[PDB]
């Protein structure tokens, strides 16, 4: 009933706001010229790169890795640091959706392991605009076009996320509904390898009819908004492909490559 429904879709607000620093809000402020305290570092290029990585310097230190390699590969290891950071952030997150702990353990590894990367590219389209994607929480700005001179390899990973961002973008979701389609996106049961799909799916076509729910009431003006977001969850399955066989390349192509542990094991054997 609809009561539970919105309860469903408090509950996961709530924790969504608890789960993840960088809510769409708070970056669409910092992107437009709200909050005054400060307005981000742009790098749009190579010397602009430096000074941004030499104030970071003028900071403490923080172990990630300071340079004495290729930029292309610095900024490709960045990216995937602050993707750990934020494989931590969802599991957390996913932890709140109710139902999910009480699945078998393996499945929700299985979950985790699939729907890791889908969230981290929805949530990466809050901080990125047609021109640029915002960086270390905010402080920072790197342009589209910049992140597009990289070598080719690297020169062109983040391209089909903008393309993907300025399309999802324009549904003008908000917060509440990302917390709620983030939460369908978990609960797939069509992911490789699970034991148990009847639960999986008992709890995701709740989520669907609370995300409706979502929908309709926060943006009644907008036509078949839930049909055109359901859709978006192809591109993004997309996005997450095309990003594994960029993966391979470079395995197959780099002198060495070097994955986080936690990458590692979301990466083993995936689509
Ligand atoms: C926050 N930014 C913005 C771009 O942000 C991202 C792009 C791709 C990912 C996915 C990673 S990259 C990989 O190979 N595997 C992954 O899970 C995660 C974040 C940066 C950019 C440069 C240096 C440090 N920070």
């Known amino acids: ?42 790098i749009y290029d190579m010397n602009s790169l430096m000074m941004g990585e030499d104030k970071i ?31 931590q952030e969802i599991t957390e997150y996913a932890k709140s959706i109710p139902g999910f702990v009480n699945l078998d353990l393996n499945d929700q590894v299985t979950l985790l392991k699939y729907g890791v990367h889908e969230i981290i590219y929805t949530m990466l389209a809050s901080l990125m605009n047609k021109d640029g994607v915002l960086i270390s929480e905010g402080q920072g700005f790197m342009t589209r076009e910049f992140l597009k001179s990289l ?29 709620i389609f983030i939460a369908v996106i978990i609960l797939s049961g069509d992911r490789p390898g699970l034991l148990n799909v009847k639960p999986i799916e008992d709890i995701q076509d709740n989520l669907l009819q609370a995300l409706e729910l979502q929908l309709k009431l926060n943006h009644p003006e907008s036509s078949q908004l839930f049909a055109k977001l359901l859709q978006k969850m192809t591109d993004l399955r997309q996005i997450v492909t095309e990003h594994v066989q960029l993966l391979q390349v470079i395995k197959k192509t780099e002198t060495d490559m070097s994955l986080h542990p936690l990458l590692q094991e979301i990466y083993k054997d995936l689509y």
């Open 151 to 179: 070598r080719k390899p690297f020169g062109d990973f983040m391209e089909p996320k903008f393309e993907f961002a300025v399309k999802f973008n324009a549904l003008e979701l908000d917060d509440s509904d990302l917390a």
């Open 1 to 42: 009933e609809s009561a539970d429904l919105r309860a469903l879709a408090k509950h996961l607000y709530d924790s969504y706001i608890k789960s993840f620093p960088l809510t769409k809000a708070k970056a669409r402020a910092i992107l437009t010229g709200k909050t005054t305290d400060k307005s981000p570092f742009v």
């Open 57 to 87: 310097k003028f900071k403490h230190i923080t172990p990630l890795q300071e340079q004495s390699k290729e930029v292309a590969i610095r900024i490709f290891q960045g990216c995937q640091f602050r993707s750990v950071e934020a494989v």
